[PDB]
Amino acid sequence: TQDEMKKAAGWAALKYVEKGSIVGVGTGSTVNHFIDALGTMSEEIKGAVSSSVASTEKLEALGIKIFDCNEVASLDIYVDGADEINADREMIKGGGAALTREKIVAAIADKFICIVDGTKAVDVLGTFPLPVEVIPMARSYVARQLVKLGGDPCYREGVITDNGNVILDVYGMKITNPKQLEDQINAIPGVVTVGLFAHRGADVVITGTPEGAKIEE
Amino acid sequence: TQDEMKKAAGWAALKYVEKGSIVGVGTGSTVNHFIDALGTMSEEIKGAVSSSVASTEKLEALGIKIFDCNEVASLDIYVDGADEINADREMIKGGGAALTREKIVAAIADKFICIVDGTKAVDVLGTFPLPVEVIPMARSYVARQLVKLGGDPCYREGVITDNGNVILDVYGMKITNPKQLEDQINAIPGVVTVGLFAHRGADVVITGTPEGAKIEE
Ligand SMILES: O=C(CO)[C@H](O)[C@H](O)COP(=O)(O)O
Ligand SMILES: O=C(CO)[C@H](O)[C@H](O)COP(=O)(O)O
């Protein structure tokens, strides 16, 4: 879209931030704008948990206390973007962000508020390549296993995750049963995290639009 | 029980080694006797893939070439001990070994040869604590989910894995559906690897008995 639909979206999420709460925050241009609105009410927020280095440092600057996951038993909400989202509110995530961090913070939060522009909604997950984080000694193993499942895995070379794992971006899948494929990939030895958020998906999906931001609760 | 028994199981495994092959080798006292056996055949095999730092050293001193998992497309056999093993040949492993390492070599290998003394076979898995490797930031969350599954997770403090992950040793479970439980744990965000070898269990079980090795196939 334009930076303004993203921004319309990001600011519409501020309405789920209640007083005295600790806010799950994700990462991305759309969440950027959400962090901008969150700063306008820093005084009635206990603080935040972020799955992103950029967001954390931005929350800090704004004087928002940062929590770690092990300090909390739950989050009320986690606000975050998606790579793709289907009509069942299942998503591909982690293409351009810390996949493992996201999926953990999302797991701990009660409500997932997905904030997105017009380009993320799809009927069938998979045109956007699915990321899988992989123990490096297992990389060729996992790739073979992803092939068998009807993917074409491409090793994201020259980079690792903060933990030192590698990433395979899997192309060419027609992910008609995301919950199944999550299970299948999660069961391959050497898999760390898969970027299918199917068992746990979006709860509220906010889309940026020319005029304003449509909310699907 | 006795090392004589462990020794008996270890040497009994030599029989499964093909001239010219690259052998999957595991860890432990029983495995060391197998490494002894492999030695008497050094100049005749191609090399070994090891799941163990101590086993790697031992193979090297026999002049056996070390291959990494990324270097092979498969392994013929993987010979390894287990912490517990049921009548369905499903195993708890990783208790005092490189959990993730073992599960990956085990996945890549065609036949898993489990060498044990009399003390490893159990009726129901779970008296020995189930090791789960966990992303640090996920530890409390994953612990809370394992409790929901009927376990009492105990954080193995002072140590991390190679990967820099932590270990939860999970006591108190009656693991009467190992395939199911491995599915449930594998699907908790923040889990890296669980010490249930259930979907891929042992193909051959060698037990050292008071009356020689005994082979269950
Ligand atoms: O890569 C994904 C998560 O890793 C997301 O789609 C992205 O990080 C955030 O969305 P956007 O930049 O479109 O607002
Ligand atoms: O591969 C290791 C996993 O914990 C162990 O060494 C194996 O389970 C046990 O065999 P042994 O009783 O001789 O050590």
From Swiss-Prot, chains A, B:
EC number: 5.3.1.6
Record Pfam families: Rib_5-P_isom_A (PF06026)
Pathway: Carbohydrate degradation; pentose phosphate pathway; D-ribose 5-phosphate from D-ribulose 5-phosphate (non-oxidative stage): step 1/1
Leader sequence residues: none
Coiled coil: none
Job description of the protein: Catalyzes the reversible conversion of ribose-5-phosphate to ribulose 5-phosphate.
Descriptive protein name: Ribose-5-phosphate isomerase A
Gene from which the chain derives: rpiA
